[PDB]
Coordinates of C-alpha atoms and ligand atoms in Angstrom, one line a residue:
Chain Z
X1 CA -20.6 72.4 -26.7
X2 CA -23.6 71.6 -29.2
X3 CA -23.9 67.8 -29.0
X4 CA -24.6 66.9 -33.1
X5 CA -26.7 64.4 -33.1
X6 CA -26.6 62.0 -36.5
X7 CA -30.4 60.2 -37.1
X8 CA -31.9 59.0 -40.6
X9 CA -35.0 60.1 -42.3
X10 CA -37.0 57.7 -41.6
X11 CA -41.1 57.3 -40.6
X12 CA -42.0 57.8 -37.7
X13 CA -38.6 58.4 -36.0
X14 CA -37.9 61.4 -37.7
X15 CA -39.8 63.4 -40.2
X16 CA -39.8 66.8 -41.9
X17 CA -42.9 68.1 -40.7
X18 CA -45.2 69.6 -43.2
X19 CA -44.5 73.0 -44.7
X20 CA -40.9 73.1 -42.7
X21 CA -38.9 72.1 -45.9
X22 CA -37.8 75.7 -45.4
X23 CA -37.2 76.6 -41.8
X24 CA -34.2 75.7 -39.7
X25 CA -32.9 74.4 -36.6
X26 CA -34.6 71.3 -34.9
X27 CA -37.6 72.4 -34.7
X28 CA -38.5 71.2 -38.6
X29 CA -38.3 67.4 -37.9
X30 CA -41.4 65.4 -35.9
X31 CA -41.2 61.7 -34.7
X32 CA -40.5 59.2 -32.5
X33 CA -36.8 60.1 -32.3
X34 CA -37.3 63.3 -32.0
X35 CA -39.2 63.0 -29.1
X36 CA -36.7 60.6 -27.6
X37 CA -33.6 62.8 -28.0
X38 CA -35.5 66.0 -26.5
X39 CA -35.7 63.9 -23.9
X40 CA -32.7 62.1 -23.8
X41 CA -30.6 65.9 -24.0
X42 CA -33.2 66.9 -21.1
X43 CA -32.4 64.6 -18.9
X44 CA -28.5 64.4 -19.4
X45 CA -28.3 68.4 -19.9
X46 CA -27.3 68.7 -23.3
X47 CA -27.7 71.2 -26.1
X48 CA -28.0 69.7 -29.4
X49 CA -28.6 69.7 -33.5
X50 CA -30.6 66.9 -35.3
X51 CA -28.4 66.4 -38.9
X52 CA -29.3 64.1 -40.9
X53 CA -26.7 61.1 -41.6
X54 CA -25.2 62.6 -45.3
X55 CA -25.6 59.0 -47.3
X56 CA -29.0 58.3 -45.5
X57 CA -27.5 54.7 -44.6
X58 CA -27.7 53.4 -41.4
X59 CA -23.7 51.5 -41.1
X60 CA -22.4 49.1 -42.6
X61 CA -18.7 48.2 -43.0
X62 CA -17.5 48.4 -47.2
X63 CA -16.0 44.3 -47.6
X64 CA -13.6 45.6 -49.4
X65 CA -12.5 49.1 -48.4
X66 CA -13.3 48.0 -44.6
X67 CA -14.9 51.8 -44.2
X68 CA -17.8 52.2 -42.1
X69 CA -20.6 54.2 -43.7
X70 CA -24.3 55.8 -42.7
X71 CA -24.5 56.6 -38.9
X72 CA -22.0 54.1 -38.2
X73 CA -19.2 56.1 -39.7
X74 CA -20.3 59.5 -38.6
X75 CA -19.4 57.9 -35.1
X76 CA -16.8 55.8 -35.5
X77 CA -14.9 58.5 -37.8
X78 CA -15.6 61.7 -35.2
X79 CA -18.2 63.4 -37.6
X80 CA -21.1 63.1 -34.7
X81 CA -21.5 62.7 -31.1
X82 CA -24.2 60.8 -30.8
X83 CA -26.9 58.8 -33.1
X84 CA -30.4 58.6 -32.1
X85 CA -32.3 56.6 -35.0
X86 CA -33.8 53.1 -35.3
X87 CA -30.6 51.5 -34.9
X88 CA -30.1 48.0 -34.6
X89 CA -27.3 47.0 -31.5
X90 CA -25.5 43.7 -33.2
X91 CA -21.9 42.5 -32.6
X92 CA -20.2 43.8 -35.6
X93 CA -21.0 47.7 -34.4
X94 CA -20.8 46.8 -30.5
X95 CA -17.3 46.1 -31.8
X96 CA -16.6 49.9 -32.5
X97 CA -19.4 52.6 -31.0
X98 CA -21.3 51.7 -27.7
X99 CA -24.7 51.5 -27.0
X100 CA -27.4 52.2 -24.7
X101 CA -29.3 49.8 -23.6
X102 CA -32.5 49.4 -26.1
X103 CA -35.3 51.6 -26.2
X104 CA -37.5 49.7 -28.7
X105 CA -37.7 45.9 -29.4
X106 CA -38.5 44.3 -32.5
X107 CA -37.4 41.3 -34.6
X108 CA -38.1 39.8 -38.4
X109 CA -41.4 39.5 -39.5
X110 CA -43.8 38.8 -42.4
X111 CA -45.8 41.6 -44.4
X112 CA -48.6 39.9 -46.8
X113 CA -51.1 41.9 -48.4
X114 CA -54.8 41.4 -46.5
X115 CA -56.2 38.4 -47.7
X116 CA -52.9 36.3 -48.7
X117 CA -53.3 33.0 -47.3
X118 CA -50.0 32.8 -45.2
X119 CA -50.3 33.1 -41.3
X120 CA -46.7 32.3 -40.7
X121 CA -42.7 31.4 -42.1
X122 CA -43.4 27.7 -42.4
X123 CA -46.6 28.6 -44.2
X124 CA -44.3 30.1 -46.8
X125 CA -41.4 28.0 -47.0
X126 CA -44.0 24.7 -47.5
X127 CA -45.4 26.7 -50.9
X128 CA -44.5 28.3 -53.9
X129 CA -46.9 30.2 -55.4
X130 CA -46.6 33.2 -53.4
X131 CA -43.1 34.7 -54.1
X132 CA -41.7 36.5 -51.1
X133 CA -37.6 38.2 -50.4
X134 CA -36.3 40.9 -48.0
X135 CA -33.6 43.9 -48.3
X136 CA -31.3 43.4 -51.0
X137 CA -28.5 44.5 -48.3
X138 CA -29.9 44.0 -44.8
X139 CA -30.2 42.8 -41.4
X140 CA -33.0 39.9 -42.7
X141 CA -30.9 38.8 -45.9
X142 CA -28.1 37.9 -42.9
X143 CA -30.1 36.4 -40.4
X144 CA -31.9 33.7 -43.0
X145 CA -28.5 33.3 -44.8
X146 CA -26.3 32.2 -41.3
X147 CA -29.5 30.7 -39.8
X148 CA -29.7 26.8 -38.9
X149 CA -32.9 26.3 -38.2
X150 CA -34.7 23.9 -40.9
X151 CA -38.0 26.4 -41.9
X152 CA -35.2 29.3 -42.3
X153 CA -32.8 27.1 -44.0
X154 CA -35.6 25.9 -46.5
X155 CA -36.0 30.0 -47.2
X156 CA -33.2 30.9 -47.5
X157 CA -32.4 27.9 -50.3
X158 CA -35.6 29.4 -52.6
X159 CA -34.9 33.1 -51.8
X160 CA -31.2 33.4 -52.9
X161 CA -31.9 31.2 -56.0
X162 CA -35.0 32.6 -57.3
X163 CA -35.1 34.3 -60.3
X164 CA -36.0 37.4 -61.0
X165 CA -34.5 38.2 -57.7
X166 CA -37.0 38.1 -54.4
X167 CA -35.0 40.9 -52.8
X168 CA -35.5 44.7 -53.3
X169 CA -33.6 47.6 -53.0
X170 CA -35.3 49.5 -50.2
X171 CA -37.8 49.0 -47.7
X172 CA -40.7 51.1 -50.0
X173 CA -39.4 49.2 -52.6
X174 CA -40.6 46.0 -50.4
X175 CA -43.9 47.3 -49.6
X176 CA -45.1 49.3 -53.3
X177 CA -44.3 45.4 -54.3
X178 CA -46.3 44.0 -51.8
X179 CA -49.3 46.1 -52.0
X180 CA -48.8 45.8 -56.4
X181 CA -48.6 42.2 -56.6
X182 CA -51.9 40.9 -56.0
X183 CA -51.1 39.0 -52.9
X184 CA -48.5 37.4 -54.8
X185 CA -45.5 38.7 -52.9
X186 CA -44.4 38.6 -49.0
X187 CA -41.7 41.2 -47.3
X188 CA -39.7 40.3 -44.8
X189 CA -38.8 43.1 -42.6
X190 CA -38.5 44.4 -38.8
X191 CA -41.3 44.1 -36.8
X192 CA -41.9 47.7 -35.8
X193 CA -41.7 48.8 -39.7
X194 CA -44.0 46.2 -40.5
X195 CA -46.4 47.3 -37.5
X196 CA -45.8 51.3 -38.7
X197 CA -47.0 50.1 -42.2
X198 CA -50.0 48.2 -40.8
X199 CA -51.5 51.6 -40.0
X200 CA -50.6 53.6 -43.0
X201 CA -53.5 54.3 -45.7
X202 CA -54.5 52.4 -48.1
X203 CA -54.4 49.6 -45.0
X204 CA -53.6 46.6 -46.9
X205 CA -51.1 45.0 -45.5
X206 CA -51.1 43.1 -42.7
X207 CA -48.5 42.2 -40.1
X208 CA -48.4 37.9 -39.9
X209 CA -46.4 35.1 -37.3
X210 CA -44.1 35.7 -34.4
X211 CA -41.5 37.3 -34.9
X212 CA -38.6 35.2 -36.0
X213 CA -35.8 36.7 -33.7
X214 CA -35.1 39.4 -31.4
X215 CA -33.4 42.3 -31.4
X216 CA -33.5 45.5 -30.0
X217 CA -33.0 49.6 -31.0
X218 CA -30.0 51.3 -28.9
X219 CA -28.5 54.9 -29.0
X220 CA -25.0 55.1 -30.3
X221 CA -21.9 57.1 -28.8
X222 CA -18.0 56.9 -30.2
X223 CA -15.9 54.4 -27.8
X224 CA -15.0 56.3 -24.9
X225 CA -17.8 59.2 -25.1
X226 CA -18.4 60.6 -21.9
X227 CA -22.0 61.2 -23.0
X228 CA -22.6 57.1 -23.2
X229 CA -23.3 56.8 -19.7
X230 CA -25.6 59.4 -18.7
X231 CA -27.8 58.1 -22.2
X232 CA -27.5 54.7 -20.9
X233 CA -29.0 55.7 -17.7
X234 CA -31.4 58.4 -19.0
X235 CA -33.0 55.4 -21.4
X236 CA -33.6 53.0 -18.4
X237 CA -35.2 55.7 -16.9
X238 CA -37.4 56.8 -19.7
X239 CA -38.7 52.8 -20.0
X240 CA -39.8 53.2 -16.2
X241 CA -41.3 56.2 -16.9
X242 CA -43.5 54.6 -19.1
X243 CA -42.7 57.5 -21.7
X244 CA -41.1 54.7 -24.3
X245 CA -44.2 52.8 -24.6
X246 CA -46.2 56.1 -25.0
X247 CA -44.2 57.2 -27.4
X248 CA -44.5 54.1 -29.5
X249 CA -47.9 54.3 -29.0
X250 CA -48.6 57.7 -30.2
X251 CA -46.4 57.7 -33.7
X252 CA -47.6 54.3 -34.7
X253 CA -51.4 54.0 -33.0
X254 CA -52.6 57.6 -32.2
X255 CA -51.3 59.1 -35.6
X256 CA -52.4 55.7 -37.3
X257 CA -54.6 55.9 -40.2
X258 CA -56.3 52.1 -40.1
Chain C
X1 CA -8.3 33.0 -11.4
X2 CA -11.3 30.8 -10.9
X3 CA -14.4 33.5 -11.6
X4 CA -16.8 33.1 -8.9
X5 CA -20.8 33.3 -10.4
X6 CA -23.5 34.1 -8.3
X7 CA -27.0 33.0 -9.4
X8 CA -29.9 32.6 -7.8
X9 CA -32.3 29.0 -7.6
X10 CA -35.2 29.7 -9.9
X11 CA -37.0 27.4 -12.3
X12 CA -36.3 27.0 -14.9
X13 CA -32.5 29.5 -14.8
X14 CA -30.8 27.6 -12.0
X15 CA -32.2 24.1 -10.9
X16 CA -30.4 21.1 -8.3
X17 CA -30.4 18.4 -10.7
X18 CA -32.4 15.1 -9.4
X19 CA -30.9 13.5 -6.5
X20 CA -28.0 15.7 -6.6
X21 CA -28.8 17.0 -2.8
X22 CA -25.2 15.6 -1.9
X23 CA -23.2 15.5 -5.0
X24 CA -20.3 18.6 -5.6
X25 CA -19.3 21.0 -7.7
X26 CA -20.8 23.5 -10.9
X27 CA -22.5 19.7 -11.7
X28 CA -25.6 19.8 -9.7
X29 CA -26.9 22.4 -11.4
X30 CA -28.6 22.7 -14.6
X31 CA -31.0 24.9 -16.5
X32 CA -31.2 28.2 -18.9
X33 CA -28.6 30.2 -16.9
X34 CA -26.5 27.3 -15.8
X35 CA -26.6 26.7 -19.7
X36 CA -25.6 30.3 -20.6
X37 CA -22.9 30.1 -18.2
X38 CA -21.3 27.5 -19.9
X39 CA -21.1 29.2 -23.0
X40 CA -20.2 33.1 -21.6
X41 CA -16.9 31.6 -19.7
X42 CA -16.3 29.6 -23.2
X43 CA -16.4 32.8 -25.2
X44 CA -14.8 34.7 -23.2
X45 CA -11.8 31.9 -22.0
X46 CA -12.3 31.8 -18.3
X47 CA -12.9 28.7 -15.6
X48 CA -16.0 30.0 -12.7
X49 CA -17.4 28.3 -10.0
X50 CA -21.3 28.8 -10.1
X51 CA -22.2 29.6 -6.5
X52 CA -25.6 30.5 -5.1
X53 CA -26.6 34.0 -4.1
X54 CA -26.2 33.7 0.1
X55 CA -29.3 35.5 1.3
X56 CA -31.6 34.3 -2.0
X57 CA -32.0 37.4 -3.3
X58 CA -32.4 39.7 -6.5
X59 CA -30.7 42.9 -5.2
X60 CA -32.2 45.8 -3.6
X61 CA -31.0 48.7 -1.5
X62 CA -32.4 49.0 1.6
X63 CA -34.3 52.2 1.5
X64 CA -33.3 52.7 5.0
X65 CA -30.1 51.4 5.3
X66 CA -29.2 51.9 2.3
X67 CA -27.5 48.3 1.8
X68 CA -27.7 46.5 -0.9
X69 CA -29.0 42.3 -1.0
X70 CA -28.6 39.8 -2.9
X71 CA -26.7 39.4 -5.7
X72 CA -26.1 42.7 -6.3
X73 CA -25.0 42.9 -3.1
X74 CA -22.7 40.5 -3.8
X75 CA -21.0 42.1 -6.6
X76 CA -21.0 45.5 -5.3
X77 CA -19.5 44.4 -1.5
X78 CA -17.0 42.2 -3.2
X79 CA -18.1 38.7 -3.0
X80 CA -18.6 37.6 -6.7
X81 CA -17.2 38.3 -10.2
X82 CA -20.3 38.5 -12.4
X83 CA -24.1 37.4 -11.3
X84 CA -25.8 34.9 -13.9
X85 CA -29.5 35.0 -13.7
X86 CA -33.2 36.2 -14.5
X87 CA -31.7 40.2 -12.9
X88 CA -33.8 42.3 -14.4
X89 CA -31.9 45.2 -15.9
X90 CA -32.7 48.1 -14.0
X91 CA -31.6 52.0 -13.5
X92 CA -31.0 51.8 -9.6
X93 CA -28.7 48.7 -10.3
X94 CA -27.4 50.2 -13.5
X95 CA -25.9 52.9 -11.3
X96 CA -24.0 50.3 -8.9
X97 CA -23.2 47.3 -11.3
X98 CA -23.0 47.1 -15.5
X99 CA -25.2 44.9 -17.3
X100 CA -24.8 43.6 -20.4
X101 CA -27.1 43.6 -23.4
X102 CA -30.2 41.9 -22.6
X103 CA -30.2 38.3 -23.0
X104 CA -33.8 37.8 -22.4
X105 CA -37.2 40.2 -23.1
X106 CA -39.8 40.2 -20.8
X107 CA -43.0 42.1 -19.5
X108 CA -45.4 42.2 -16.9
X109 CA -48.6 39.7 -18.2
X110 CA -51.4 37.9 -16.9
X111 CA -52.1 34.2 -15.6
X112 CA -55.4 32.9 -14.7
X113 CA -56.7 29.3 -14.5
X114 CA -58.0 27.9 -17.5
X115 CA -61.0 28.2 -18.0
X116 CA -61.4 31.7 -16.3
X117 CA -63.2 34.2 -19.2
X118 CA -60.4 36.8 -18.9
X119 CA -58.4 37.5 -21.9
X120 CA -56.8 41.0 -21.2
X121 CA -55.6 43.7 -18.3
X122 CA -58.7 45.7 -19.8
X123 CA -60.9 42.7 -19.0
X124 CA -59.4 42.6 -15.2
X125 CA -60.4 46.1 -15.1
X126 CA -63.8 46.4 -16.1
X127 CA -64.8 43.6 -13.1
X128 CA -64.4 42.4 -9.4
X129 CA -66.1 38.6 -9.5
X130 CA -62.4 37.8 -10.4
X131 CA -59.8 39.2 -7.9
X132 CA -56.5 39.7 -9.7
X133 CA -53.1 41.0 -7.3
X134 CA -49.4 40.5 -8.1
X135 CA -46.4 40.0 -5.3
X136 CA -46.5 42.3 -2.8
X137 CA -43.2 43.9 -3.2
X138 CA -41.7 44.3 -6.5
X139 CA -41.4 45.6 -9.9
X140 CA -44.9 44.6 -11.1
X141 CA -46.8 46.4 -7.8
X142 CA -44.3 49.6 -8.9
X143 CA -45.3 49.4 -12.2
X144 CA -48.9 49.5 -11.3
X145 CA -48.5 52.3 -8.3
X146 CA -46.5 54.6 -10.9
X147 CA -48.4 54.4 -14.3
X148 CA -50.6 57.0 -15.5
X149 CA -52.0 54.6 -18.2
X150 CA -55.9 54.8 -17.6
X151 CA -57.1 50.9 -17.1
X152 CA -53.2 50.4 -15.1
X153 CA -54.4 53.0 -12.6
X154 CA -57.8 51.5 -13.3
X155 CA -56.9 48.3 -11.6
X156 CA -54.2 49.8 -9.1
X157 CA -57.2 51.8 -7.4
X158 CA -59.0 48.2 -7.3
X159 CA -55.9 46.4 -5.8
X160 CA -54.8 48.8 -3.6
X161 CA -57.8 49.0 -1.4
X162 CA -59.0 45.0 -2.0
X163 CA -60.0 42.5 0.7
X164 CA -59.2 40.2 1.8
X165 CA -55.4 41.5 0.4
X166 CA -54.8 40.5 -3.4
X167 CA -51.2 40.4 -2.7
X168 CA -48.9 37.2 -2.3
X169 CA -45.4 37.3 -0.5
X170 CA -43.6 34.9 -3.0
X171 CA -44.2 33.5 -6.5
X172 CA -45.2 30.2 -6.0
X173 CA -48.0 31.5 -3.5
X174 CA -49.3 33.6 -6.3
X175 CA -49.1 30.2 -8.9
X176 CA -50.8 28.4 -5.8
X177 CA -53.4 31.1 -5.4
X178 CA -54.2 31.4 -9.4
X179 CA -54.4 27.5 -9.0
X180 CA -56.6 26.7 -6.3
X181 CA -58.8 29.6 -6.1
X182 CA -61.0 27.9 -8.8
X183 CA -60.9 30.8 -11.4
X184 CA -61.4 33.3 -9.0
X185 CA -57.7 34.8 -8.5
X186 CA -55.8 35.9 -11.8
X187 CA -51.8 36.5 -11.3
X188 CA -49.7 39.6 -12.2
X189 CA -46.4 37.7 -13.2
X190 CA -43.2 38.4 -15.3
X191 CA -44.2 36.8 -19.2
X192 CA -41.0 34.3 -18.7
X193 CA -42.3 32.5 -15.7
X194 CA -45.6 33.1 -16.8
X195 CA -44.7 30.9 -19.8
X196 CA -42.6 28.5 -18.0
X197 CA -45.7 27.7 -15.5
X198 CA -48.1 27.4 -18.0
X199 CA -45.7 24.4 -19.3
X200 CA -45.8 22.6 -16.0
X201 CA -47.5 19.6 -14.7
X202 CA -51.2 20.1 -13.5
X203 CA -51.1 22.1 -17.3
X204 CA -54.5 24.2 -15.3
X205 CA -53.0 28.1 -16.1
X206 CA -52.7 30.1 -19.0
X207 CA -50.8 32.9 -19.7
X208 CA -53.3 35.5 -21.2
X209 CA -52.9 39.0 -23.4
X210 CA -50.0 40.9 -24.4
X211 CA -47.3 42.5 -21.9
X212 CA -48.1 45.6 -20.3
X213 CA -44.5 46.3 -20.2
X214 CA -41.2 45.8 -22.0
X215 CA -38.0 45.0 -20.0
X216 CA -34.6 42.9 -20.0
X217 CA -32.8 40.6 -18.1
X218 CA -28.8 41.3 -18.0
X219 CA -25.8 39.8 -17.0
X220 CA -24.1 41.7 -14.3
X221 CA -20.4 42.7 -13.3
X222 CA -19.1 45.7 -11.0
X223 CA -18.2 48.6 -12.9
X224 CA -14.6 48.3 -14.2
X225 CA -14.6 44.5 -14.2
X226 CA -12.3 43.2 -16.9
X227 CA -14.8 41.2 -18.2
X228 CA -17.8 43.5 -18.6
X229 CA -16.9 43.9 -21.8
X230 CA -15.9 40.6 -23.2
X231 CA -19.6 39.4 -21.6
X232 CA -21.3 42.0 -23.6
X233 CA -20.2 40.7 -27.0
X234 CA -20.6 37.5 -25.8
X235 CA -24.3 37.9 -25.7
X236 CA -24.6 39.6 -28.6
X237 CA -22.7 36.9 -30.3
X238 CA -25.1 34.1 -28.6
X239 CA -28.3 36.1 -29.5
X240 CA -26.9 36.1 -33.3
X241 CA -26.0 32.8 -33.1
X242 CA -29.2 31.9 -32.5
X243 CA -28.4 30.2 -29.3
X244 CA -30.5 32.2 -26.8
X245 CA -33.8 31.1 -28.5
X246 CA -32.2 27.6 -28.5
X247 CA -31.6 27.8 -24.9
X248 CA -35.3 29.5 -24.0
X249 CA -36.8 26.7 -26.2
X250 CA -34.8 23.8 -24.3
X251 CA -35.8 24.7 -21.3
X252 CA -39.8 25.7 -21.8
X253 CA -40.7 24.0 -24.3
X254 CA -38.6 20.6 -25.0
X255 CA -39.1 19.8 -21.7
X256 CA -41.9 21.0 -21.4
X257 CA -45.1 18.6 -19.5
X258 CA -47.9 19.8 -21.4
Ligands
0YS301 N1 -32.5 49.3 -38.3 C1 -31.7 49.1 -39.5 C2 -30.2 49.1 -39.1 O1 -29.8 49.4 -37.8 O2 -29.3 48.9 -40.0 C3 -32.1 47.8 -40.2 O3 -31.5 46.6 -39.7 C4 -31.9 47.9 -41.8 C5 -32.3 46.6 -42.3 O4 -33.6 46.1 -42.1 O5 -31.5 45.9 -42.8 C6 -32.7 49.0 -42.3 C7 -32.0 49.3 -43.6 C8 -30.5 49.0 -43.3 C9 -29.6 48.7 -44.5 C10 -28.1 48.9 -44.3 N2 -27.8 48.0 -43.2 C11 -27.2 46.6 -43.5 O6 -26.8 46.4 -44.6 C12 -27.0 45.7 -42.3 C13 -27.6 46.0 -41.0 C14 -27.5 45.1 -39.9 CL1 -28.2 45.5 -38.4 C15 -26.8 43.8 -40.1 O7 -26.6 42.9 -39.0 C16 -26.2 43.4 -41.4 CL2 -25.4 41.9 -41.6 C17 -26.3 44.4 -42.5 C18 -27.7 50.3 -43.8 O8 -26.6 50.4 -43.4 O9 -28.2 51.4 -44.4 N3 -30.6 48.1 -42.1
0YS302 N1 -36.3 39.4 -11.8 C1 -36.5 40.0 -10.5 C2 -35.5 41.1 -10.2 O1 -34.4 41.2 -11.0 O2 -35.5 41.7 -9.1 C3 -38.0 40.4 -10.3 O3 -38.2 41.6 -11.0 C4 -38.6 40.3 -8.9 C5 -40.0 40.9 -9.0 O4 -40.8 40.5 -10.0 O5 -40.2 41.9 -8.4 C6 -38.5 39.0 -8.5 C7 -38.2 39.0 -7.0 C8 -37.6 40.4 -6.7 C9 -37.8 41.2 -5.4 C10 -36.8 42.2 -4.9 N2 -36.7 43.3 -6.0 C11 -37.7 44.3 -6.0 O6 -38.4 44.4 -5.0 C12 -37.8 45.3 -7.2 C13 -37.2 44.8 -8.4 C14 -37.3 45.6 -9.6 CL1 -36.6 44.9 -11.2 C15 -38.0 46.9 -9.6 O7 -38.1 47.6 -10.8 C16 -38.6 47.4 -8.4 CL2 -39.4 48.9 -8.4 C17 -38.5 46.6 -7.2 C18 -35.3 41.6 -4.8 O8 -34.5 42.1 -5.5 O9 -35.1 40.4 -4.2 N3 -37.8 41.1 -8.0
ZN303 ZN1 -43.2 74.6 -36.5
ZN304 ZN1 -38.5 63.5 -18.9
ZN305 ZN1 -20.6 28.8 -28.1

């Protein structure tokens, strides 16, 4: 009765450490999710086994084929048991696995390179000359494309039209072309990424604005697991045990570099 | 099959319209959760009838007695369908009721009178010419007594042993305190009515530094309700929508006296 439990490589959640490429069992990955699922099996009295999500996505449903991939499908297609990775609760996955309440908060934000003159979304949809996009497939590229509000609209408008594309294929894809361009180029991207990269050498980038929505981080169970409870409960208790915000502090402040 | 809410009167959630002291019905009532309300028992088809919480309570279990108030008292001892309101999601009440998805972030954050040359937690910590104290019974004292954060344990050491007491019975005593103590009393309030306060007429508080703490405000329904779920993607849809920052916005900020 091994609970496997799907999660994403992904900095800081989870993270080979160094020199483990080799070595087996749990004990080779580091990182915020790491943490939080020794915790989470401690305190709902579970053995586990980290594996890492086979087409390192997180889940989305295929338009066409209607098949859920990444995480998403591991659960929803009886592969895993449980998923503890940055995973973002919206309606579409509510729909099939449950989650637990959220562990970590975060909405959209704006990465500039240190020294661009933008302090905020207006600031970028009133200009031109600085170019800036988001995940070619993502969470962002939705919220700006269904959004009504007037600033978001105006982005929206200039990002889907402009040419060569704005968007980029993965999130260091988004930064390398941040940090290359001179302070020509602004990434859209959730908050906490933007916040881990904030304290990642060379140090300049910078995190800018409020955020521009809210969402939160939740741990995912297939419908009708009789593990989804006991998480729910054991991440409520975590959060008033403090140990959430410590553990956000350590892998992004602590082990920060800037 | 009318779905009786409970809520609970608090500015700006649940409000008796002007000069509605004898008028009838869910129509003297407005504000955020009177709002939210309307559009829950939309999405999920139903007719309710909003009804205040009896005793004008959150919900806690009498340590003693081991009774719960309020309004989760009054879903747990059978007296109301589903409670709409600032009910902060919680693992005591988590084991007795289900929330949903939180429809509202919060933390614990500081007020002082403007003008008062306090700008952080770590600020209160380092002094005593400015007294600083929270409710006397509730999350925020909890959080303080419990946490093993260095300045937080800092400034419980200060306010459990202060005199005259740094602690107020109710919210508005705390406001009132802040207010007239002539930036000598700084309050330790949830960041939601922090925010709503500092929009209110005299405009003399400000709500200073980050939160200490990250938590959520559900909507609650006994376990096996048939409408926990349904309310649960309800939010979710509202939050995507874009319609809970709407709402928050409405009522701090578009009406907002300063
Ligand atoms: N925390 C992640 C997630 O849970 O998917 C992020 O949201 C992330 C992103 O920023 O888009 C990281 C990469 C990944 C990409 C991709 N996800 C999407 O295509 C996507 C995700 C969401 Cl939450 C959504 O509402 C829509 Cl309309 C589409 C993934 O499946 O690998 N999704
Ligand atoms: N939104 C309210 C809540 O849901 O009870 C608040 O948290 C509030 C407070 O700030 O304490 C407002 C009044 C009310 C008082 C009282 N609740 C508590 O005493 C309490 C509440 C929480 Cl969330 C908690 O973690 C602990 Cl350890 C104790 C009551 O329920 O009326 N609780
Ligand atoms: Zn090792
Ligand atoms: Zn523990
Ligand atoms: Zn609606």
């Amino acid at each position: 009765k091994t609970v496997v439990v799907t999660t994403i490589l992904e900095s800081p959640y989870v993270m080979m450490k160094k020199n483990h490429e080799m070595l087996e069992g749990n004990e080779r990955y580091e990182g915020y999710c790491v943490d939080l699922a020794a915790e989470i099996a401690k305190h709902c009295g579970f053995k586990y086994k980290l594996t890492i999500v086979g087409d390192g996505k997180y889940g989305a449903r295929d338009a066409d084929t209607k098949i859920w991939n990444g995480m998403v499908g591991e659960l929803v297609y009886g592969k895993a048991d449980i998923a503890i990775a940055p995973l973002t609760i919206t309606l579409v996955r509510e729909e099939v696995i449950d989650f637990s309440k959220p562990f970590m908060s975060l909405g959209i934000s704006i990465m500039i390179k240190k020294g661009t003159p933008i302090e905020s979304a207006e600031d970028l949809s009133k200009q031109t000359e600085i170019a800036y996009g988001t995940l070619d497939s993502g969470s962002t590229k939705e919220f700006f494309r269904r959004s009504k509000i007037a600033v978001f609209d105006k982005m929206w408008t200039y990002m889907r039209s402009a040419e060569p594309s704005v968007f980029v294929r993965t999130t260091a894809e988004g930064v390398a072309r941040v940090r290359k361009s001179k302070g020509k180029y602004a990434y859209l991207l959730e908050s906490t990424m933007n916040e881990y990269i904030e304290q990642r050498k060379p140090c300049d980038t910078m995190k800018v604005g409020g955020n521009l929505d809210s969402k939160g981080y939740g741990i995912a169970t297939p419908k009708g697991s009789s593990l989804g409870n006991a998480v729910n409960l054991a991440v409520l208790k975590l959060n008033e045990q403090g140990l959430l915000d410590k553990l956000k502090n350590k892998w992004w402040y602590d082990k920060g570099e800037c």
